[PDB]
Amino acid sequence: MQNDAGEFVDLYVPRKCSASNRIIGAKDHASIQMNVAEVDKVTGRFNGQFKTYAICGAIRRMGESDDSILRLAKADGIVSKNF
Amino acid sequence: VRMNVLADALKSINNAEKRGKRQVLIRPCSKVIVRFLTVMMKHGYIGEFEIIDDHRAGKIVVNLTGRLNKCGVISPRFDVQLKDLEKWQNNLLPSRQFGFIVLTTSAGIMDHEEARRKHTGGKILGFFF
Amino acid sequence: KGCEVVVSGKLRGQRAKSMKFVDGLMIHSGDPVNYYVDTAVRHVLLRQGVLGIKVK
Amino acid sequence: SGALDVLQMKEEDVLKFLAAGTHLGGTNLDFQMEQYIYKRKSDGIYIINLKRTWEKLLLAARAIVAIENPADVSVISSRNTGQRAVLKFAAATGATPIAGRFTPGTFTNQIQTAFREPRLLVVTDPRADHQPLTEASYVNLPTIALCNTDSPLRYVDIAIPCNNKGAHSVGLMWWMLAREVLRMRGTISREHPWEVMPDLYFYRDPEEIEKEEQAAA
Amino acid sequence: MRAKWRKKRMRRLKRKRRKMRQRSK
Amino acid sequence: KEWLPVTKLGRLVKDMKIKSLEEIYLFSLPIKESEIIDFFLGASLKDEVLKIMPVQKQTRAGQRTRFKAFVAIGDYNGHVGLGVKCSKEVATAIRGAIILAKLSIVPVRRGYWGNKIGKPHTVPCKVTGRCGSVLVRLIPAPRGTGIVSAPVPKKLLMMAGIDDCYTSARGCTATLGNFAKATFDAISKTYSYLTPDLWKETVFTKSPYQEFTDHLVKTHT
Amino acid sequence: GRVRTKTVKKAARVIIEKYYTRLGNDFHTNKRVCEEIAIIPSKKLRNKIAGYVTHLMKRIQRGPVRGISIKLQEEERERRDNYVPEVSALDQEIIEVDPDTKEMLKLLDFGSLSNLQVTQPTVGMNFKTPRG
Amino acid sequence: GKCRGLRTARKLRSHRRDQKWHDKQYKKAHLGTALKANPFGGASHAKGIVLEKVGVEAKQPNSAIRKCVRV
Amino acid sequence: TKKRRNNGRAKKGRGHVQPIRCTNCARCVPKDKAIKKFVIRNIVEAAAVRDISEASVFDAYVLPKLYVKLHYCVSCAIHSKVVRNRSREARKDRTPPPRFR
RNA sequence: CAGAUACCGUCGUAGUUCCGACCAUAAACGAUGCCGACCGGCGAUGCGGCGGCGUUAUUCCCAUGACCCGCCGGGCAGCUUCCGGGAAACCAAAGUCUUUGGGUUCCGGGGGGAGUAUGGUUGCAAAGCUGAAACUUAAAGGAAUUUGGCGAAGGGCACCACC
RNA sequence: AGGUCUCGUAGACCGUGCACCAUGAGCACGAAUCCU
Ligand SMILES: [Zn+2]
């Protein structure tokens, strides 16, 4: 995104999907941004640490987006590993 | 019948990355195929791959990332020199800043910048960007 | 809350045409037309012909 | 959503799940729901693993409680099985209910007087409510769905494996989502059983309503 | 005309041309 | 002559708590109010007609002609838009076309030809836009070359800010609407092309809605 | 053919909506009610309003209607919705459990429960309608 | 192209020659018929002697006579 | 243009079927293309049943039926109104019309 | 019927049938060459093979045939689909194509003249294969939409229609 | 011992053709925009 001097020349850096690793377009209204809450370890209380994920529109209209969110929650470690 | 294993291999990995898969199988193996994926793995366009060493011809499990755009094969293998490589790079790469030409010279199989540095030519295999 | 103007005559050509500009509400039947709208017709004489005005 | 110990099925929710007929589902099988199914029982009935229902239920509960504005989550039901359940869910968790005749244009048509534009959609069935899922594609709207073994999987983010046919299962799962969202909200207790009435979220046919009002006072 | 009967009248013209060719020798 | 928004994006831009349109393009939020971009992009946003064409519908009595208007919007340093509208009169058609084109505006990035010196000037890669049978292909060009094309993608690339192009077209180019829409699609597809200069994992910045939930509840129901 | 127009039905619906406590079954009494409360430029229109209001009162007296929601049948729908039984209807003393469901429940979290019982399975796999 | 062999130049050449012969302009410019039946014979201007002056009519959608000569 | 996915018939991998004749017409039609009518009806429908049963030698007698197969050409099927044309989206329906009486 | 050497009806010649010798032509169509790979699902169908609660060949066992539940390979097919493509109709191939290359054969450059004249060739003949030019023309076409028109169909209406 | 078993009765899917029915002179037609 650079030049030879070093100054940032592009106007923004677009997002990429967490499942297909494709660039989310500015007019792709099928794309999502979802927030999932992190809980305290012993109490079971919501404190506010957030770990958001984005899915591009093609994966969502494919029918395999829930599996993508399931694999992201497997990778982060919040949902149980035995499953 | 099957007359080019490398063209079918790169077509299969192109279809797999275009659909959005993560692992693919390539039915035949060759040393030239392993060199081709080694070039793309050194350049970071594909992930860490595997060799299913079965006694027929190795099956290759390639880990796919989203960094690949298109993998293509030029058939037949055209003779290319140092003076004629710029035309291929102009009409076959999408841009001058990225993309690589995989050509087989006598000192191995790698990208065209390294063959420019060693000042050698040969036969072209394909491209990726 | 409702209006209608109609022009007809020579509008840039030999054959006469009619342009209608309607905006709002317009009652066409019954006695409320007799006491909710006012209709005036005038003739405009131009150089190339005569032009008509109808306002409601 | 299950890595801890308090986020586990303790004693009685297993009994509620077995009483409401949760474990038995539809005859046919969707290919996206293959990970959620153990093994086909005889006479063409598929068996849903209750662990996966629990973990996807906690994932949906986390997704609901993540937003701080309860008016920005909308629950959807156009079938007679879940009319009162979504209304009482919106009464308990502060959501916004849509029950019967989801009009085509609440999400996209701007000058329509019923323009409700939420941040989160929670629906009880994808097949009977394909029209909210279609209009959830033209706007950046994540969806929560309760998915059966037969229902298609499309424009979904968290699919809770369920049996959305009987009234007992639908009402029990709506009560479980309400209980989990209120438990991570903090307006209700955790150790004390808050269970005042479990039958509050069950739709019943009106013939049972006249039979009950003639049997009782 | 359609192609079938135009083809047939062309074949009849061919026939008449062939007999006048053979009898004009 | 005041602005009364109907969506929460219009109010959240109206109260000067959205700094620019860049995060709207980043979070891929749909735009339904045309005065947001008029609030952001002001004096540098210019427009001109491209073609007005008539279409006819056959009825019992005579023929009914409705006029379809094309227009291009975009400032000379970035974003560009296009819109199609048809109406019975010409003034209503051009006003609806200007409003609908101003509503739907894409962003475009610019790249370099070989050497990354100075400000970017050309398309960073080979992009292709297609609708109908119309094909258009954009090639990166050296500096100072100038736009070589047909007049209508020359106009669209002047409103796109790119001054260096090599073009190649195929098909029925006489249809101005499909040619303009194909060039607009070729311009808008420049972001769905992952070059290795952005292979790093992005950091997820904060969404506007959840950040200003308190202000939305404080302002409107 | 005497079919009422949409303005008659809409006006009758809203006048039976906002005013119910001063209506009856006699056509003349609610005719005078519609004359006194609603301003109507004619007499035949008011008369048709009165007739359709009388018909709607006679149907509301029998059962509920899906177009008018008056105050008195309201609170009754949420009384039926807020009805609760003193039993829980899922806390039954014995629960009939499939053997496949039991070999699920033995391996998930539990080993033995004294509240569940087993049932025999069927002998034949006949579960599809004969189609071909 | 269809034939993509490394040692195929002849089939490409002969097929290109045959499909170039299956044309109109290349068929016109390379045969002796289109120049032998040409009144000018590959010439731009020519001289001649007029013998009769004949006025030929116009086509369908317009009505005139056209002044011509026989040369 | 292509009106139907098949050709109004039931030939997929054959290339030739045995031709048959029409009943209303005498037209040579292929067997898989013709409209078939396997009709079941009584000798006496609803008026002479009581007259036959009240003038019969035998009590508790069943009435025999007529079992014939009708082979129809396309024009003879339309002209007798056996089958009628449908919409483009409603052409794809392949179920028979439901029976009630 | 104005005409009817036509639609309709009664007769009726070659032919329709088999043997033997010929010609090599169809809307010979799936209007879609052959081989090879990849790329969604669903329920059935014909063959071969495998596994499994149960019923029948009259009550026990085994294998076989006859049903039920699932798979494997090949074949004719069907339903849905913002995978993808196309001018669209539509296509799981007519996809993997400007991000243009797996191998290979035949074949088309606007509409008429024209599958025509001539030359060669096959044949008893009818004809088959190869196959132009002069001249003329600014359109001839493909898909789809909106109107009108049907001696097209399905519902309603009118004493300027009928009974 | 009782003496008409009970619950409501589309209980028309009766048919197929259908005499003659041809033609139409053209001139009458022209596509667009913003405020001081
Ligand atoms: Zn017939």
From Swiss-Prot, chain D:
PTM summary: Acylated. Acylation may be a prerequisite for conversion of the monomeric 37 kDa laminin receptor precursor (37LRP) to the mature dimeric 67 kDa laminin receptor (67LR), and may provide a mechanism for membrane association.
GO cellular component, one term: cytosolic small ribosomal subunit
Cross-link (Glycyl lysine isopeptide (Lys-Gly) (interchain with G-Cter in SUMO2)) at residue(s): 88
Residue numbers of N6-acetyllysine PTMs: 51, 88
Record GO biological process: ribosomal small subunit assembly; translation
Region (Interaction with PPP1R16B): 53-112
Site feature location: Cleavage: 114-115, 132-133
Modified residues (Phosphoserine): 42
Keywords associated with the record: Acetylation, Cell membrane, Cytoplasm, Host cell receptor for virus entry, Host-virus interaction, Isopeptide bond, Membrane, Nucleus, Phosphoprotein, Receptor, Repeat, Ribonucleoprotein, Ribosomal protein, Ubl conjugation
Keyword Transmembrane belongs to the record: no
Region named Laminin-binding: 160-179
Modification sites for N-acetylserine: 1
Record GO terms (molecular function): laminin binding; laminin receptor activity; structural constituent of ribosome; virus receptor activity
Modified residues (Phosphothreonine): 96
Localization: Cell membrane; Cytoplasm; Nucleus
Note: This protein appears to have acquired a second function as a laminin receptor specifically in the vertebrate lineage.
Family: Belongs to the universal ribosomal protein uS2 family.
Protein name as it appears in the record: Small ribosomal subunit protein uS2
Species: Oryctolagus cuniculus
Curated annotation (Swiss-Prot), chain E:
TM region positions: none
Main location, first listed in the record: cytoplasm
A GO BP annotation: translation
Listed GO MF terms: structural constituent of ribosome
Alphabetically ordered keywords of this record: Cytoplasm, Ribonucleoprotein, Ribosomal protein
Region Disordered: start-end pairs: 1-25
Subcellular location: Cytoplasm
InterPro entries, per the entry: Ribosomal_eS32
GO CC list: cytoplasm; ribonucleoprotein complex; ribosome
Reported function: Component of the small ribosomal subunit. The ribosome is a large ribonucleoprotein complex responsible for the synthesis of proteins in the cell. Interacts with the beta subunit of protein kinase CKII and stimulates phosphorylation of DNA topoisomerase II alpha by CKII.
Subunit note: Component of the small ribosomal subunit.
Protein name according to UniProt: Small ribosomal subunit protein eS32
The gene coding this protein: RPL41
Curated annotation (Swiss-Prot), chain G:
Listed name of the protein: Small ribosomal subunit protein eS17
Residues the record lists as N6-succinyllysine modifications: 18
InterPro entries assigned to the protein according to its UniProt record, in alphabetical order: Ribosomal_eS17 (IPR001210), Ribosomal_eS17_CS (IPR018273), Ribosomal_eS17_sf (IPR036401)
Residues recorded with modification Phosphothreonine: 129
Any single GO CC term annotated in Swiss-Prot or TrEMBL for this entry: nucleolus
Family classification: Belongs to the eukaryotic ribosomal protein eS17 family.
GO BP annotations listed: translation
GO MF term set: structural constituent of ribosome
The protein's assembly and partners: Component of the small ribosomal subunit. Part of the small subunit (SSU) processome, composed of more than 70 proteins and the RNA chaperone small nucleolar RNA (snoRNA) U3.
Keywords: Cytoplasm, Isopeptide bond, Nucleus, Phosphoprotein, Ribonucleoprotein, Ribosomal protein, Ubl conjugation
PTM info: Ubiquitinated at Lys-102 by RNF14 and RNF25 in response to ribosome collisions (ribosome stalling).
Main location as per UniProt: cytoplasm
Phosphoserine sites (modified residues): 112
Placement of covalent cross-link Glycyl lysine isopeptide (Lys-Gly) (interchain with G-Cter in SUMO1): 102
Cross-link (Glycyl lysine isopeptide (Lys-Gly) (interchain with G-Cter in SUMO2)): 102
Function: Component of the small ribosomal subunit. The ribosome is a large ribonucleoprotein complex responsible for the synthesis of proteins in the cell. Part of the small subunit (SSU) processome, first precursor of the small eukaryotic ribosomal subunit. During the assembly of the SSU processome in the nucleolus, many ribosome biogenesis factors, an RNA chaperone and ribosomal proteins associate with the nascent pre-rRNA and work in concert to generate RNA folding, modifications, rearrangements and cleavage as well as targeted degradation of pre-ribosomal RNA by the RNA exosome.
Locations listed in the record: Cytoplasm; Nucleus, Nucleolus
Curated annotation (Swiss-Prot), chain I:
Keyword Endoplasmic reticulum: yes
Gene Ontology CC, one term: cytosolic small ribosomal subunit
Protein name listed in UniProt: Small ribosomal subunit protein eS26
Modified residues (Phosphoserine): 53
Entry's family note: Belongs to the eukaryotic ribosomal protein eS26 family.
Quaternary state and interactors: Component of the 40S small ribosomal subunit.
Keywords: Cytoplasm, Endoplasmic reticulum, Phosphoprotein, Ribonucleoprotein, Ribosomal protein, Zinc
Compositional bias segments (type: Basic and acidic residues): 86-96
Role according to the record: Component of the small ribosomal subunit. The ribosome is a large ribonucleoprotein complex responsible for the synthesis of proteins in the cell.
Single GO biological process annotation from the record: translation
Binding positions (Zn(2+)): 22, 25, 73, 76
Lineage, highest ranks first: Eukaryota, Metazoa, Chordata, Craniata, Vertebrata
Primary site of residence: cytoplasm
Species this chain originates from: Oryctolagus cuniculus (Rabbit)
GO terms of molecular function: mRNA binding; structural constituent of ribosome
Compartments where located: Cytoplasm, Cytosol; Cytoplasm; Rough endoplasmic reticulum
